[PDB]
Design a protein around this ligand. Structure first.
Ligand SMILES: *[C@@H]1O[C@H](CO)[C@@H](O[C@@H]2O[C@H](CO)[C@@H](O[C@@H]3O[C@H](CO)[C@@H](O)[C@H](O)[C@@H]3O)[C@H](O)[C@H]2NC(C)=O)[C@H](O)[C@H]1NC(C)=O
Ligand SMILES: *[C@@H]1O[C@H](CO)[C@@H](O[C@@H]2O[C@H](CO)[C@@H](O[C@@H]3O[C@H](CO)[C@@H](O)[C@H](O)[C@@H]3O)[C@H](O)[C@H]2NC(C)=O)[C@H](O)[C@H]1NC(C)=O
Ligand SMILES: *[C@@H]1O[C@H](CO)[C@@H](O[C@@H]2O[C@H](CO)[C@@H](O)[C@H](O)[C@H]2NC(C)=O)[C@H](O)[C@H]1NC(C)=O
Ligand SMILES: *[C@@H]1O[C@H](CO)[C@@H](O[C@@H]2O[C@H](CO)[C@@H](O)[C@H](O)[C@H]2NC(C)=O)[C@H](O)[C@H]1NC(C)=O
Ligand SMILES: *[C@@H]1O[C@H](CO)[C@@H](O[C@@H]2O[C@H](CO)[C@@H](O)[C@H](O)[C@H]2NC(C)=O)[C@H](O)[C@H]1NC(C)=O
Ligand SMILES: *[C@@H]1O[C@H](CO)[C@@H](O)[C@H](O)[C@H]1NC(C)=O
Ligand SMILES: *[C@@H]1O[C@H](CO)[C@@H](O)[C@H](O)[C@H]1NC(C)=O
Ligand SMILES: *[C@@H]1O[C@H](CO)[C@@H](O)[C@H](O)[C@H]1NC(C)=O
Ligand SMILES: *[C@@H]1O[C@H](CO)[C@@H](O)[C@H](O)[C@H]1NC(C)=O
Ligand SMILES: *[C@@H]1O[C@H](CO)[C@@H](O)[C@H](O)[C@H]1NC(C)=O
Lengths: 438, 91, 200, 50, 41
């Protein structure tokens, strides 16, 4: 007969980091295996459609990475903007909304997320770097046939999609996810999200300032936690490091001999006449094909892993940002209320806003109240006692109310319920009926 | 034709010197050579008008075949993300 | 072979903690601090959640408890009787055993060489030919390792997907009451209980 | 105008079995490929980072 | 959209009118009181 019920609550904001896309690479098969060598290329033709297959595999990967980015971020058909007032009931979104004073119009949190992650591939017109310094190694520096293609959507375009999603969520709740965006005051969006988790709307209104202050504090805490902790963006840096490691190994394999007299194709052609050079070249070709096939096989496996991650990120954006998910721990710890996307290089960061019950007290309970021989069951909530009086309270927040005919329903005789406790159930209407005439 | 990762100045110099390995040449005029982040795009007119992406190129730039002035030609543009919608939010 | 970081005792302790939390506190176990609730009221809430008025449980509480106890006994008997009940985990064990036995078996293959033993090649042949025969054995054995690692990466991806599904099911079926049809068994979902198993 | 309403119910318990992890293995390429043969190891060195 | 009259059955009461931000003044129609005054007269 003991039940614990929270008498307070905490607003908790947590982060979830998901990869969305992988660096798009391209390999010049002829340059890598037989760079500027006609004899080697002619020997390479005896292996069939090698290059014709790797090119398709890497193109499919590149297209898949752009598809993954569009599936995660291109979930909205219109670009939504917030009003210039930017007052939302006391909820401060300045750390997640675009900062107009900075180039690229990233939010402060997005700016930190981009500054923390180091990108080794740095896709751009690499010829701009030219020379005049020791080679960067960014990982072939193009010269060995390995290049990086830029994404279709720039960081600014991803930030604009994130801004549109944020403005839609803030100004219209879930009505924008399902259909046209319908404006709603933010505190009423919160009231309906409270209803989603089984807590009466009035809890928000009496504590609206407390809730707004806890939200703003949680956002500041996230800002400080991400800034302070070095290894915060682990998953995205790990993806970058794996791609960089794969390219470093693939390029370094060019220096291997694989049984040849020399790792340099020009040295073989210079030193030997055709009939011996063909053997040494065939040995190098075999080694180069083994290196490229291994690289592509791992890139396909990593691409499948990234695809699964991107599909999870898109599912989470649909269920956590464009609605209020009821799946436990799907959208962070606590009862899911809502989330906010933030762009990150090669990925997405979700800020999940949830409630954690706090300051629980244990009350005596009872399955039903027995009045005039009838078993009364709660319509919503549970029966509690502070030791002297029985009350009906909502399950997820302590708020005692008088047990009445309108709060309970009647089903059966008191004898069937094992734990039924004798108590008065108050009967509205009858009380005033008396007062009317008596 | 997209020359991936190459500066358009280098392309013009290589073309004038007849140094490029492919022996075909794309018709070059003013405004037909556009520098993208992906590479140098030769044979498409860049326009300020933004449209939905059709044939992706990269780094926000997409090409399509569209009627200009009177005369259908290939153009390149910065992708439109979608229509704008200002929500009449108020207390 | 490396041992797991968490031993069977630690996994059993996590399962025990999950069972104690779910039994004592219901759906609150995974949202915040555990809040005790009498079990019949936890079931009453779960019944209301599926769409059956909470009075049904209390009026039929003994029948429901007896049906639950019978079902659990039937589950233990079903797992005992059917040798194939646990086939997924035996298949994972057998596939890893087969992969390791395959790699060891490949060491006896010649791959075109005159002999499968490096010492026999070095003893019987001059260095010039011996280097070629050794290069053939190295090529074959390196291909065997590359094939093994590729297959392990594919199997690892499959296991990762299965583990992610298991974690999702535990967080949605054990730490709460799911409304997803057939996600947490056939019928209208009331609750679930984890049990540890080797590799799963 | 016909609807079927249940008048009784059954509590059912089913089992779902999922793999979570697989055996963790580690390979020493030199011993596997070159069983303490120095000449084999020296030839193996020409295959780089595999 | 389907407008209904605001009554004591459609709404619930919790707290006073000073704490809620943006609360507005309106009539809430109680069915029981109205029937009492029709029954009486
Ligand atoms: C919404 O929240 C942001 C912060 O998350 C508020 O901006 C903050 O406004 C305070 C106002 O005092 C700034 O304090 C200033 O700090 C500097 C630190 O050097 C100090 O020198 C100044 O004298 C002052 O104390 C704070 O820096 C500023 N933070 C940022 C990041 O801009 C914003 O005002 C909030 N808006 C609403 C409507 O509540
Ligand atoms: C709804 O279905 C349940 C079963 O799923 C019904 O409970 C079952 O009722 C039968 C009687 O018709 C019980 O059989 C009796 O069992 C006792 C055991 O000692 C035996 O001595 C009797 O001779 C007879 O065989 C059966 O045990 C019981 N099941 C359980 C789990 O208690 C229930 O009556 C049904 N209700 C309605 C309204 O249809
Ligand atoms: C249980 O709650 C009831 C309701 O608040 C308490 O009784 C009231 O206590 C206040 C003072 O806090 C008085 O002003 C009311 O007149 C009391 N009403 C009645 C009907 O007694 C009761 O004291 C509480 N008991 C415990 C043990 O906390
Ligand atoms: C709740 O109230 C009912 C009626 O006031 C009690 O019913 C009595 O129970 C006693 C045994 O405790 C019997 O000897 C009486 O004959 C019963 N009378 C009637 C009219 O039913 C019931 O016991 C009370 N329960 C509790 C827990 O106090
Ligand atoms: C809503 O109605 C209440 C009650 O009529 C108003 O409260 C009164 O306000 C006047 C001045 O506007 C005071 O002189 C009265 O003493 C107040 N009475 C009470 C009981 O509060 C309230 O101001 C109204 N609010 C609006 C926005 O019209
Ligand atoms: C709930 O906790 C907050 C601090 O997190 C406190 O300011 C507030 O007064 C508490 N409310 C109650 C009713 O104890
Ligand atoms: C191309 O080269 C010219 C040389 O003057 C330079 O000014 C320009 O910035 C370069 N552009 C790129 C994209 O490399
Ligand atoms: C409330 O919980 C505490 C936990 O230690 C326990 O000691 C106390 O007896 C409980 N009280 C009731 C009334 O259940
Ligand atoms: C776009 O408009 C600007 C306006 O200053 C102009 O300078 C630029 O040349 C225009 N670009 C094109 C492709 O017409
Ligand atoms: C909403 O209320 C705030 C209260 O400070 C006010 O400043 C703001 O102008 C109001 N919004 C509108 C649209 O009137």
């Amino acid at each position: 007969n003991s039940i614990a019920i929270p008498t307070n609550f905490t607003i908790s904001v947590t982060t979830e980091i998901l990869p969305v896309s992988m660096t798009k690479t391209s390999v010049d098969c002829t340059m890598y295996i037989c760079g500027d060598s006609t004899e080697c290329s002619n020997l390479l033709l005896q292996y069939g459609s090698f290059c014709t297959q790797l090119k398709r595999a890497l193109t499919g990967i590149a297209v898949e990475q752009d598809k993954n980015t569009q599936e995660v971020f291109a979930q909205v058909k219109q670009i939504y903007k917030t009003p210039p007032i930017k007052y939302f009931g006391g909820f401060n979104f300045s750390q997640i909304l675009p900062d107009p004073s900075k180039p690229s119009k990233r939010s402060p949190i997005e700016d930190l997320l981009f500054n923390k992650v180091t990108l080794a591939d740095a896709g751009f017109i690499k010829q701009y770097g030219d020379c005049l310094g020791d080679i960067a190694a960014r990982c072939a520096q193009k010269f060995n046939g390995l290049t990086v293609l830029p994404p279709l959507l720039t960081d600014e375009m991803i930030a604009q999609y994130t801004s549109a999603l944020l403005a839609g969520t803030i100004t219209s709740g879930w009505t924008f996810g399902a259909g046209p965006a319908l404006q709603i005051p933010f505190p009423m969006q919160m009231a309906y999200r409270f209803n989603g988790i089984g807590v009466t709307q009035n809890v928000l209104y009496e504590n609206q300032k407390l809730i707004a202050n806890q939200f703003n504090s949680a956002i500041g805490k996230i800002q400080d936690s991400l800034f302070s902790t070095p290894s915060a963006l682990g998953k995205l840096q790990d993806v970058v490091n794996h791609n960089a490691q794969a390219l470093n190994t693939l390029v370094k394999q060019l220096s291997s001999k694989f049984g040849a007299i020399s790792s340099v194709l020009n040295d073989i052609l210079s030193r030997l006449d055709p009939p011996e050079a063909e053997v040494q070249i065939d040995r190098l070709i075999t080694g180069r094909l083994q290196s490229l096939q291994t690289y592509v096989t791992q890139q396909l496996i990593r691409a499948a892993e990234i695809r699964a991650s991107a599909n999870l990120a898109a599912t989470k954006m649909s269920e956590c940002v464009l609605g209020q998910s009821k799946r436990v721990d799907f959208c962070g710890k606590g009862y899911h209320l809502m989330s906010f996307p933030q762009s990150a290089p090669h990925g997405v960061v979700f800020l999940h806003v949830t409630y954690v019950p706090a300051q629980e007290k244990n009350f005596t309970t009872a399955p039903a109240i027995c009045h005039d021989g009838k078993a009364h069951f709660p319509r919503e909530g549970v029966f509690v006692s502070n030791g002297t009086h029985w009350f009906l309270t909502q399950r997820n927040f302590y708020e005692p109310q008088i047990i009445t005919t309108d709060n309970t329903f009647v089903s059966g005789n008191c004898d069937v319920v094992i734990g039924i406790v004798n108590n008065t159930v108050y009967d509205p209407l009858q009380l005033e009926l008396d007062s009317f005439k008596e | 034709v997209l020359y991936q990762g190459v500066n358009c100045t280098e392309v013009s110099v290589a073309i004038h010197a007849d140094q490029l390995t492919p022996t075909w040449r794309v018709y070059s005029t003013g405004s037909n050579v556009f520098q993208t982040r992906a590479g140098c795009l030769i044979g498409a007119e860049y326009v300020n008008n933004s449209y939905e992406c059709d044939i992706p190129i990269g780094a926000g730039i997409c090409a399509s075949y569209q009627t200009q002035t009177k005369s259908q030609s290939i153009i390149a543009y910065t992708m439109s993300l979608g229509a704008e919608n200002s929500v009449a939010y108020s207390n």
